[PDB]
Symmetry: D2
């Protein structure tokens, strides 16, 4: 479970970075 | 942007499945 | 923890619904 | 759309904090 949670966290960090970028492009 | 958002959607689909699985394990 | 996980799942379900909508608007 | 994406970002910020907290509890 620890490893699963770490992977989900890394995904959400990526989402924050990606959505902040889209925000800027818009 | 559309391709990006598709990838995010796919991630969230995986997150719901994994977190639901974790919730049952616990 | 169970309740926290359920809330995160509900958020991600909303994200899927919202991003599918944005997808369509774009 | 920009307002929507901001709300998603805010959610993911909460998710990273909560999942990290869960990861420590476990
Ligand atoms: Zn996310
Ligand atoms: Zn960038
Ligand atoms: Zn997620
Ligand atoms: Zn999400
Ligand atoms: Zn709608
Ligand atoms: Zn999330």
């Amino acid at each position: 479970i620890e490893e699963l949670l770490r992977k989900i966290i890394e995904d959400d960090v990526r989402h924050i970075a990606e959505l902040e970028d889209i925000e800027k492009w818009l």
